[PDB]
Design an enzyme around this catalytic site. Structure first.
Site, short mmCIF file in Angstrom:
data_model
loop_
_atom_site.label_atom_id
_atom_site.label_comp_id
_atom_site.label_asym_id
_atom_site.label_seq_id
_atom_site.Cartn_x
_atom_site.Cartn_y
_atom_site.Cartn_z
N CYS A 1 26.37 25.99 -20.26
CA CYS A 1 27.15 24.79 -20.57
C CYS A 1 28.64 25.02 -20.40
CB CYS A 1 26.87 24.30 -21.97
SG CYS A 1 25.22 23.63 -22.11
N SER B 1 18.81 20.53 -15.67
CA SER B 1 18.53 21.91 -16.10
C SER B 1 19.14 22.22 -17.47
CB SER B 1 18.98 22.95 -15.06
OG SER B 1 20.39 22.99 -14.90
N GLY B 2 19.90 21.26 -18.00
CA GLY B 2 20.51 21.36 -19.33
C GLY B 2 21.96 21.81 -19.41
N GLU C 1 -3.32 6.49 -0.71
CA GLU C 1 -4.44 6.91 -1.59
C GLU C 1 -4.96 5.81 -2.52
OE1 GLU C 1 -4.07 9.53 0.34
OE2 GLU C 1 -4.62 11.07 -1.14
N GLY C 2 -5.05 4.58 -2.02
CA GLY C 2 -5.57 3.48 -2.83
C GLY C 2 -4.69 3.01 -3.98
N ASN D 1 31.58 24.76 -22.30
CA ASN D 1 32.14 24.65 -23.65
C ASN D 1 33.57 24.19 -23.58
OD1 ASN D 1 29.77 25.88 -24.53
ND2 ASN D 1 30.80 27.65 -25.45
N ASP E 1 0.84 -1.19 0.00
CA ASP E 1 0.00 0.00 0.00
C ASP E 1 0.88 1.25 0.00
OD1 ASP E 1 -1.78 2.13 0.58
OD2 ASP E 1 -2.98 0.87 1.91
N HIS F 1 30.58 19.81 -23.55
CA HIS F 1 30.36 19.49 -24.97
C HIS F 1 31.27 20.24 -25.88
CE1 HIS F 1 28.49 23.36 -26.12
NE2 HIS F 1 28.13 23.40 -24.82
CA LIG Z 1 -4.11 3.82 0.16
#
Ligand SMILES: [Ca+2]
Length: 245
Positions: free
Chosen positions: A191, A168-169, A86-87, A193, A83, A173
């Site tokens: 970046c 975040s990129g 929330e199901g 570079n 479980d 490179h």
């Molecule tokens: Ca539950």
């Protein structure tokens, strides 16, 4: 009403000393405590570690300091029929076993604009770099190496030998356009570079979980919850966790 877990890194991978265990669910998890309780991580040599949630679906586990090379890690995500709040119930179990390789830490110092690669404490490579402009600086802090791309269209720019170091990129490179500035002036959107030759070298010599540390830039610090910024969360915050938050 079922959620499936996915675990990284991959079964049988050799990863760097910064690689966290990641358990990602395909649905939001309401009871983080139950999910954590269902995940058993065994380390050899044994090391203390703890869980921290990066978002509603993904929990990370790591030790206080970078892993020791040679460490073997077993992850048993025993979520089948558990479980999770929330199901929602775990659809299945998953497992992974992986090991830690060499310690690889590359440090980019904005004072020198050099990225220095150290393998098990030894300088193996130095490369001039051009980091983020003052208006778009590269954040300081500890970045974990993620995915790599021989070629990628960034977002529209064609890029070779791209090693991702933040969600975040930020990438290390190939930047043929800033070769003249590398080692001298920051010109990028964030970046790191480097020259085509150095980017290929980096691409060839790192692995997922290796570390890039950025120091002395005019930026702030990379967010701990970036996706690859885990180590920027101080241990006492990480260990305390956010299972009840
Ligand atoms: Ca539950």
């Amino acid at each position: 009403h079922l959620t499936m877990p996915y675990v990284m890194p991959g079964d049988g991978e050799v990863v760097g000393v910064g690689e966290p265990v990641a358990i990602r669910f395909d649905e939001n998890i309401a009871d983080r405590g139950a999910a954590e309780k269902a995940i058993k991580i065994t380390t050899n040599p044994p090391v203390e570690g703890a869980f921290y949630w990066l978002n509603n679906r993904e929990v990370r586990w790591r030790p206080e300091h970078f892993w020791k090379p040679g460490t073997a890690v077993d992850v048993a995500v025993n979520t089948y029929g558990v479980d999770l709040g929330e199901g929602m119930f775990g659809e299945d179990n998953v497992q992974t076993h992986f090991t830690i390789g060499d310690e690889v830490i590359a440090t980019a110092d904005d004072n020198t604009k050099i990225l220095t690669v150290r393998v098990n404490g030894e300088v193996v490579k130095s490369m001039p770099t051009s980091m983020g402009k003052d208006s778009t600086p590269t954040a300081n802090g500890i970045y974990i190496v993620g995915s790599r791309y021989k070629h990628i269209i960034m977002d529209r720019t064609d890029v070779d030998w791209a090693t991702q170091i933040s969600y975040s990129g930020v990438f290390v490179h190939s930047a043929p356009w800033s070769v003249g500035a590398q080692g001298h002036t920051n010109t990028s959107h964030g970046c790191l570079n480097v020259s085509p030759s150095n980017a290929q070298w980096f691409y060839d010599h790192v692995k997922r979980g290796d570390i890039v540390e950025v120091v002395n830039t005019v930026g702030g610090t990379l967010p701990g919850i970036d996706g690859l910024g885990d180590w920027n969360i101080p241990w006492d915050q990480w260990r305390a966790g956010n299972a009840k938050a």
